[PDB]
Write a protein that binds this DNA or RNA. Sequence first.
RNA 1: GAGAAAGCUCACAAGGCCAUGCCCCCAUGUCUAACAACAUGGCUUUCUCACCA
Lengths: 319, 461
Amino acid sequence: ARVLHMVGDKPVFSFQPRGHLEIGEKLDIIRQKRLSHVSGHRSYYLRGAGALLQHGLVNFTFNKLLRRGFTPMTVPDLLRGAVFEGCGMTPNANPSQIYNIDPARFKDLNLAGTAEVGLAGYFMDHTVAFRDLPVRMVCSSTCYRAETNTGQEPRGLYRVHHFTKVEMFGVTGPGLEQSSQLLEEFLSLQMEILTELGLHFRVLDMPTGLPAYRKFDIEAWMPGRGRFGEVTSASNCTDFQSRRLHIMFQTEAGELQFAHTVNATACAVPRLLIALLESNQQKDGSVLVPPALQSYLGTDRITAPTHVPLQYIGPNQPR
Amino acid sequence: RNRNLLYEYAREGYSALPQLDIERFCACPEEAAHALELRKGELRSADLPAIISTWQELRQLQEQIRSLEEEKAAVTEAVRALLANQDSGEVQQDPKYQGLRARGREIRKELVHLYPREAQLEEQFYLQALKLPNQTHPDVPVGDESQARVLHMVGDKPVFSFQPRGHLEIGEKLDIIRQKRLSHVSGHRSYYLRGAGALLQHGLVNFTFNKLLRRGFTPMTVPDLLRGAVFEGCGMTPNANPSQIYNIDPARFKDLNLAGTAEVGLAGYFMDHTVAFRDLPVRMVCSSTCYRAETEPRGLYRVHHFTKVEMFGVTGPGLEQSSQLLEEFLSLQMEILTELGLHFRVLDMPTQELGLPAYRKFDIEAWMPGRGRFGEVTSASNCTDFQSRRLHIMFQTEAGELQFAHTVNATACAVPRLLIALLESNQQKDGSVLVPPALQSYLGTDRITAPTHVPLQYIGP
RNA sequence: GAGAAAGCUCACAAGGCCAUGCCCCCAUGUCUAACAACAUGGCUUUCUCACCA
Ligand SMILES: Nc1ncnc2c1ncn2[C@@H]1O[C@H](COS(=O)(=O)NC(=O)[C@@H](N)CO)[C@@H](O)[C@H]1O
Ligand SMILES: Nc1ncnc2c1ncn2[C@@H]1O[C@H](COS(=O)(=O)NC(=O)[C@@H](N)CO)[C@@H](O)[C@H]1O
């Protein structure tokens, strides 16, 4: 858990830090009241400034990655079981992070846990020209997690079943150095994005998961939580996604070989929303908008919504 | 086997029981039978008399229950008040006390015995009644899809020197869309977007979002997972043998479904809530992925999953206001398609295909040269009285009264259909695809060229 | 996410994360003339053992 780099300064607030959920409910941007029946449990709805923030962050990250040449891509939502087995996630175990579609209605259909599985499926059983390498593509899709821990901080926005996460996938040449430098570049890009937003963050190194040869976790300081929170995870892999999925790249000589795979997460909307709202939180509850996202939001300073908040007329209310 | 989730919801007590429209047309049976036959929904006029008779019986049983309840409440209040005064053994010995106790016991037994029969009657009547469709606007033509009238057509088919090729072939040539040998990974009818295609999709969604945001629409995001009750309220069939909506495995999770459309999510968000009169009309624009089972042989015409921006708004109580809002939504669709430049014809939907929850529906079909037939890409539906009643969405007036509010839902654009129409319409002999001026800035390139990168080689056995 | 327990949760006084007041769940049912009291279940909280690709 060594800390490779620390950037930014912790904000100083005269008043006590306020939880992101409290600010959202007061601002009404995010509502999480009595949504068990309507949207299941631990779901969330974004409206007003919140929706603009989600779209702004996804578009800003996408534009920044595209300017650097990343090839934009999209992946199918439904994925087969073999693809998940190759990426190292197994749905056979009873507690699984992979939603499983009903077998009777559909055969071997599973929702994409993350966009990395979809991109890996794309490169399955194919040969990439030795000149094309390295190949970096950014895919943006909604990711659904089957299990979110409820033992600690259950009533929080930190962990949610469905979250928008930009994913960057890069195939590299046989040389280990090429993969390592590619991962380094990915880390630099994500660090640059966080610094641009202004969130205080520290990047550490995870010891030794088993599939990933190396890993990098970026944690962003959150005032409401009062502790550091992990916001991004870029993890290298070596001849494992290819050797499991039979992904091979033909070199100039023509010998069949297995290419290395690098997968990183540019950003996640829920954690970023928490950090942005809490870091810029003001005394009256207004949230300052960073200049980088001012153009996307179009509002210099967020204020209480003019529309009156929705009232609950349901039977489950004290009378 | 088969059980509604709305009646189950009301039975458990999660939400107030919905108010049906049977009373509205109960006055004249012939008018309702004729309208229902024209709609030709799952329910038929032949079975309507049974439903009306059961409803009347239910009303009578409820009235009887209310009378017994009033008598029981009166005896309980009188006995309690009398017991408080002169609370001694002599008062207990009084014949009035004994008679009131016996009457209370008899009333309790009668009410408990009657309750199960009434509950069974309510379940059967509401189960059959839910099938009944919404009112049909008089100006809606009656017939099949072909019979649908054409309101008007904007643009003309582009003149082409050579026969335009299919969208799938052009995509494979440019490698934007890859659909070959995808059975093992994503299953059948699965598509991939690469290079210019992905940028085109993002640019279209962002352009639509910005256009709607400037008009004042409030942005909204809806969770993909939704419960079955919301689906039933929307009017779609959540569970059926040929049902097209994906349901997660019951063992892992219960009552979880993938949203058919974004409007379903917005309706769930608005379920069991009220809105201030000043806020009305409220317009919300939501962009989200939609997965449809959909149970052409090849191509992007039928796709299991796709991304479509959906605009859903709750209007005022007056029916005129709902119609006016629908007209404004139609104008917005026309401006978006005129700006893109595609040739699109807006045709009023026929009564047969209107659907269970839609009062008035406008279908906009865009001409596809490669396909050779118009493709429906935009559908607007007036959910004025069905969705609000099913989900209890109401708007409180200044006085404090609650009046049901009409809901209008429409689709701004769909990435698969608009992509196919733009590619086929702007395809050229060299293979380059022209980019419309609106998407030129977002894409940044006036046209598209063969991909620089070497396309993938299939090494699969 | 799994198991289990409880009935309330939000807000205002006041002390250096919680001492006390202020307010103290929504439904379907067993005995009760009926409030309450015990069950089944929902929801809001709290206590446990575990994965975070
Ligand atoms: N339960 C969760 N709910 C919502 N977002 C999550 C969740 N877990 C992780 N994330 C987001 O996803 C990022 C990566 O964590 S991870 O999903 O477990 N690992 C990966 O995604 C890599 N395999 C490629 O992205 C986190 O930093 C956070 O932004
Ligand atoms: N099999 C399909 N695969 C991919 N896209 C489709 C498919 N069928 C229809 N669409 C697109 O989705 C749009 C929605 O049409 S619809 O599902 O029948 N009606 C709705 O979605 C309502 N929510 C309107 O707001 C169509 O106009 C078309 O653009």
